[PDB]
Structure 1
């Protein structure tokens, strides 16, 4: 342990659907446009929830 400064979640906190890299703090969603498309939906990249297909 040295210079212990944990990363702060990108989209505030409430975006629990996002996961974050522990060292570089870069965030990616667990949910995807591929998942949503399989459900005949598309991803709302703000919340990373599946919404009506904007197509």
Structure 2
């Protein structure tokens, strides 16, 4: 009535961290690389979390 556009699940368990659009039904992590880099970290697109590459 207002839209009607079913979207397929993105993640599995830790899906709350993602954001889904009603037009493309795609997902994008909430946290950004900038935030992770703020403490020498790198946002991973698998779980949307910060990780330490080396330094």
Fold conserved (TM > 0.5)? yes
Q: Is the 8 A contact 2:5 2:22 kept in 1?
A: no
- Provide structure 2 residue ranges, at least 5 long, that are not aligned to the other structure: none
TM-score (norm 1): 0.72
Q: Distance in 2 between matches of 1:38 and 1:3?
A: 39
How far does residue 13 in structure 1 lie from its aligned partner after superposition?
Answer: 5.2
TM-score (norm 2): 0.72
Aligned residue pairs total 55
Q: Is the 8 A contact 1:42 1:54 kept in 2?
A: no
Q: Quick check: 1:34 aligned with 2:49?
A: no
> Pairwise mapping of residues 1-40 of structure 1 onto structure 2 (< 5 A)?
1=1, 4-12=4-12, 14-40=14-40
Look up the SS of the partner of 1:36 in the other structure.
Answer: helix
